[PDB]
């Protein structure tokens, strides 16, 4: 009796056991999910990975910016749960900005073919995703993305603040979509979280500087969330995409829910 | 097993077996909640329609206007839990305006005795009820209050509008407070439903103006919402209240979850 | 030529020379208005503090909580400005809170009457006023009110936050109205200002731990403005309003202008 | 005197007559600016259109999708106005759509390459401009760009709306910039206008559903708005961001200023 028993739900973006993406999956599957992977480039270690998980589930090749790859998505999700049946979630946890426009790069300093990578990847790659996958979707199904609030400037995030605004807007469009389906499609904001960019950024990749802004962010973070905010934990992430996947949230679309320990709710 | 299993729970609110708060009370017996039910005034019928739920739960008189009844809250509720259990979740579904200041009447013509009554009854008392009630809930617990969005001004509404605008702050602050005992406090942004003062106003209680308004309201609502809006189905509203009283958002607190069929992001 | 040459600006709120108000009242005579101004309580002392402005201006009596100064308001004001002539503009710069609903106060033990006192003065009021001088308002003219951000929770302004959340409802309201004359209304939201008040609690007014929270405020207000902020000078906030009180701004109603150094467009 | 007399403005976007930056730089000229205009592709005809303005005014040639033109951009200006001034002023009125993502075209049909080429039009030519002009700009300055609210999903504006989503976070990171240069950078987010791509769907280049989308859209703006609006008169808009450019604005930045009639703030 699981929050999402019998529930077939596509999880895209692990690459690390760190990966929120990670998380949503094992959350999914110790709530009775029957899951579909989706991995980019590396598949040899996301397999590796993914055999971490608390049950087997197939693992597929998905690149966003690769055309052929979402034409044939759909088909080579239904061969894998069987023909007949359908989704009824879809996780997009896919984002990448690269280092010109994130980081201690300064803002006016990132040339748009690399901004426009990161947007491709971020936010239009959501839309994709929509296009492919709702077709093989049922009626109260769901589509949900992850979000880093991106509604006041800050340090360090740059381009990628600005990829998470025009994802705001895209999920906004996809939820019209969606609807026709009779499918919700909603953000999960979450707060900082220490995944494969964001250990090398504190760790020093980018220099000292870049790493102590994220750092002063993480404080700053838990200080204002009443009930506080851990950068090591993925879990209530994880849960909370996981209660937008179920029935519990049903008249909820082209939202954002926030998993940021009440962060974005105070001043200081 | 269901999703509030074990969890004991007050729900405040129900007048009649349309109030949103006769939905939540059902939905959550209905996923294992152990309740505790509170009225105002007419008690003996808030009785005979609490006795149309799932399961038996004592009902308690409260009235938020009464500083006795506050007072006296916590006490009456650990007598019927039994001494050494708390509570894991509390709803405020209480609201209230005066004619004068919401219908019909010019916006001018609420007078402030009747702006006060109604800011009092729908805002004020979503405080009152944490500083009551906090003291008795355990860690890891949640308080949902009724909002009704009020980001934007729209007719009729008038000063029920402005009270909303009012509890959505108090909200923030009580997010401070119930942090500090590991409790989150959200509120749950709900479309328009046939509830007894809107089924009066759309039967002409007001006139016909009002009732008018009112219906191209309704209509809109559906309209805007990519999933459809039913004015007449509580359930997705109650379901949503649910899901902020388990465990599957921990991370959200001082927040609003809107379950309005997805309304407030669509212009047209 | 000035910004405002040949209008009639109706100014309230001036109790000190430090008085947002004081300010507002100087630069739109800098500016070439012609003013009538409104004070509550003191009216000697106020008439002592209102002879330093650049030019001469009647004083009317108007306590916002008493009905017969509102009802006699429009007829006060023409006898003022001459039979014929009607006001251009209107500055509502009313605002307080007793001690109990902001300052250390905790939240939770703020009386109702404290709080309904404080939403009377500083929201309700603002459609008060509009209701008494609509009528004697010219087309294409102005209503600016004073807000200080609610959208977020914060120490120290307590209910005083949730006061102007109320407001920013109102102002939505009083637009509605407004625009059946020709006018606009509008808030604009500043950043800390060293008002009567503000210097109290800094100088210890409130005890020490009071005096520390509205300068970590400031000082971290000063640090988000890409602009910075000065909590002494009222003038960047004063040429806001005369800005909204202007034809400069003719497409703006039921809206918030922020005068904040733009701090709130800032996380950290 | 003049509000903006003796200011230095450059004045991107004029393509036409009822281009909104026509009218932002007529307007601009009867207040006493003295202007640097830039034009994109079809000088001649842009130089036809720029004589109508109440004065002579010299036109550059600016493709912000060409490298070449934006690295040269601040010396041609400085040409221009003369060595040893700076300019005071700078006007953003550049934006593009292709019809893939604007118009009938389903959301989910919108080619990425298209989707990009809009995006580095409409938001990143922003921080592109910022970038060239902010080392030739005078503290005190003001940077202002061209903003359509896309807070909310809507028919036909599809990719657009994203990309205006895209330039108010790259507004707010400007303004970290602009900041360091004592300059404000600042959005207007006007109301549908009929400038040359708007006339063109109405008139049903794109089909007659999407001119009667923009036409309903057009007319619930209008009775939204409380001081209504007139999709045909870009006067309002242009004397709100000559505003922006003017001292009477001086603690506004990282912001969006709506001359959108009000209807944003109102629902119906
Ligand atoms: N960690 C945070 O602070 C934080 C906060 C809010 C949101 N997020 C978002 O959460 C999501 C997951 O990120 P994460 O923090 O788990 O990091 P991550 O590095 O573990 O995950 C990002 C994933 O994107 C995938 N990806 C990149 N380019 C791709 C492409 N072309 N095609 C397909 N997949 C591609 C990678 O393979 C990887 O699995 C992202 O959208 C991220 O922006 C992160
Ligand atoms: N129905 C809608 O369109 C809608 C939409 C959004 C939010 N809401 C909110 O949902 C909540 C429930 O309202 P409803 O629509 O179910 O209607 P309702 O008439 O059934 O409920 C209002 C409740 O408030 C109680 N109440 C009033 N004054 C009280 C007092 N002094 N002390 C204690 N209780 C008092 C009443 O007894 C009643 O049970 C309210 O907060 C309302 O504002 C309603
Ligand atoms: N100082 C700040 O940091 C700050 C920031 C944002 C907004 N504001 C707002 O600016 C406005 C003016 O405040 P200020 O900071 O200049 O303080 P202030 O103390 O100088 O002015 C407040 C004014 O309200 C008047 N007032 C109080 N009760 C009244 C009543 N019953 N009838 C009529 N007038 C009454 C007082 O006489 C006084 O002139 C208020 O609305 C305030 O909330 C202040
Ligand atoms: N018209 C509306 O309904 C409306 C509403 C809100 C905001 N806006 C915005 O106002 C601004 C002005 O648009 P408009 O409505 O006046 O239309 P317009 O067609 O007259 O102006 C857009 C301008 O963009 C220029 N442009 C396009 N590609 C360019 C490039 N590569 N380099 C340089 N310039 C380029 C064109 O030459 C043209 O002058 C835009 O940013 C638009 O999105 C328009
Ligand atoms: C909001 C948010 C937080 C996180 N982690 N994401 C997703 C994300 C972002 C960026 C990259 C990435 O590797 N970028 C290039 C890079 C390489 C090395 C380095 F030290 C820093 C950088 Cl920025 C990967 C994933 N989104
Ligand atoms: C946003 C919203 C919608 C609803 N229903 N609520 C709660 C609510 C509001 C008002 C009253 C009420 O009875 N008001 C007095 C009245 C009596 C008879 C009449 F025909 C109309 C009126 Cl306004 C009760 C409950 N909140
Ligand atoms: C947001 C904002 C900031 C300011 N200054 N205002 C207006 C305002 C608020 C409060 C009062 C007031 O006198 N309150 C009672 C009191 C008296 C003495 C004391 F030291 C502290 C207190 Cl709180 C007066 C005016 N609004
Ligand atoms: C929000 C907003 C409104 C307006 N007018 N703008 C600027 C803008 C947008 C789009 C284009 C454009 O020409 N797009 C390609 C096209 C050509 C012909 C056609 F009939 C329709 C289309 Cl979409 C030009 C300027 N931004």
Same mark, same amino acid.
Request: with cysteine; charged share 20%.
């Given at each position: 009796?699981?929050?999402?028993?019998?529930?077939?739900?596509?999880?895209?973006?692990?690459?690390?056991?760190?990966?929120?993406?990670?998380?949503?999956?094992? %959350?999914? =599957?110790? =709530?009775?999910?029957?899951? %579909?992977?989706?991995?980019?480039?590396?598949?040899?270690?996301?397999?590796?990975?993914?055999?971490?998980?608390?049950?087997?589930?197939?693992?597929?090749?998905?690149?966003?910016?690769?055309?052929?790859?979402?034409?044939?998505?759909?088909?080579?999700? !239904?061969?894998?749960?069987?023909?007949?049946?359908?989704?009824?979630?879809?996780?997009?946890?896919?984002?990448?900005?690269?280092?010109?426009?994130?980081?201690?790069?300064?803002?006016?300093?990132?040339?748009? +073919?690399?901004?426009?990578?990161?947007?491709?990847?971020?936010?239009?790659?959501?839309?994709?995703?929509?296009?492919?996958?709702?077709?093989? *979707?049922?009626?109260?199904?769901?589509? %949900?993305? *992850?979000?880093?609030?991106?509604?006041?400037?800050?340090?360090?995030?740059?381009?990628?603040?600005? +990829?998470?605004? +025009?994802?705001?807007?895209?999920?906004?469009?996809?939820?019209?979509?969606?609807?026709?389906?009779? %499918?919700?499609?909603?953000?999960?904001?979450?707060?900082?979280?220490?995944?494969? +960019? *964001?250990?090398?950024?504190?760790?020093?990749?980018?220099?000292?500087?870049?790493?102590?802004?994220?750092?002063?962010?993480?404080?700053?973070?838990?200080?204002?969330?009443?009930?506080?905010?851990?950068?090591?934990?993925? !879990?209530?992430?994880?849960?909370?995409?996981?209660?937008?996947?179920?029935?519990?949230?049903?008249? !909820?679309?082209?939202?954002?829910?926030?998993?940021?320990?009440?962060?974005?709710? =105070?001043?200081?």
């Amino acid at each position: 009796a699981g929050l999402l028993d019998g529930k077939r739900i596509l999880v895209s973006g692990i690459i690390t056991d760190s990966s929120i993406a990670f998380h949503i999956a094992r %959350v999914a =599957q110790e =709530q009775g999910a029957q899951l %579909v992977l989706t991995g980019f480039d590396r598949l040899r270690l996301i397999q590796r990975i993914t055999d971490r998980l608390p049950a087997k589930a197939p693992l597929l090749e998905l690149d966003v910016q690769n055309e052929e790859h979402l034409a044939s998505l759909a088909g080579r999700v !239904t061969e894998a749960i069987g023909a007949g049946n359908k989704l009824d979630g879809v996780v997009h946890s896919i984002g990448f900005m690269p280092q010109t426009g994130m980081g201690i790069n300064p803002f006016f300093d990132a040339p748009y +073919a690399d901004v426009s990578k990161g947007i491709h990847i971020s936010a239009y790659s959501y839309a994709s995703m929509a296009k492919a996958l709702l077709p093989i *979707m049922n009626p109260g199904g769901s589509i %949900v993305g *992850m979000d880093f609030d991106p509604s006041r400037a800050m340090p360090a995030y740059n381009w990628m603040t600005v +990829a998470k605004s +025009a994802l705001e807007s895209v999920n906004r469009f996809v939820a019209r979509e969606a609807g026709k389906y009779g %499918v919700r499609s909603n953000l999960v904001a979450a707060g900082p979280i220490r995944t494969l +960019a *964001m250990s090398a950024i504190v760790g020093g990749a980018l220099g000292e500087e870049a790493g102590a802004q994220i750092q002063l962010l993480e404080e700053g973070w838990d200080q204002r969330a009443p009930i506080g905010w851990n950068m090591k934990d993925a !879990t209530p992430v994880a849960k909370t995409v996981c209660a937008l996947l179920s029935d519990w949230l049903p008249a !909820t679309t082209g939202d954002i829910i926030y998993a940021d320990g009440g962060a974005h709710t =105070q001043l200081l």
